[PDB]
Amino acid sequence: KVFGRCELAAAMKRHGLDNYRGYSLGNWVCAAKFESNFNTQATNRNTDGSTDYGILQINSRWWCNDGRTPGSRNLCNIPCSALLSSDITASVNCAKKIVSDGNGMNAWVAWRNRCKGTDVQAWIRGCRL
């Protein structure tokens, strides 16, 4: 599923991401835009052999099991395919663990390079929340 900007903002807000660990909703919408272009089915392979899955591009080296990343962990206790669903619940629940790991949203490279320090409120402007 390819979300609209305000549709995703509302789903993220309903799942408790607004101000989760101090990160306002606009940060999460901005991260999703640049990680996946709002597409729940996005996948990208990394040079180490791990793969990133879903709207927030969660990586199989640490967070989910895809059966093809040797020596990896599955800290969210989910198959990576669960992160590609049109229902974002699994992605949001796993993202909450990632952002609590100690590095905040810096774990998302696109957030660090394209959202951090910008006017992220713009990503929710005009939405009925």
Author numbering: 1 to 129
Task: Give passages from the manuscript.
A crucial need to continue advancement is the efficient delivery of fragile and micrometre-sized crystals to the X-ray beam intersection. This paper presents an improved design of an all-polymer microfluidic ‘chip’ for room-temperature fixed-target serial crystallography that can be tailored to broadly meet the needs of users at either synchrotron or XFEL light sources. Crystals of two model proteins, lysozyme and thaumatin, were used to validate the effectiveness of the design at both synchrotron (lysozyme and thaumatin) and XFEL (lysozyme only) facilities, yielding complete data sets with resolutions of 1.42, 1.48 and 1.70 Å, respectively.
Additionally, the lysozyme and thaumatin samples were crystallized in situ days in advance. We have maintained samples on chips for weeks with no observable decrease in sample quality.
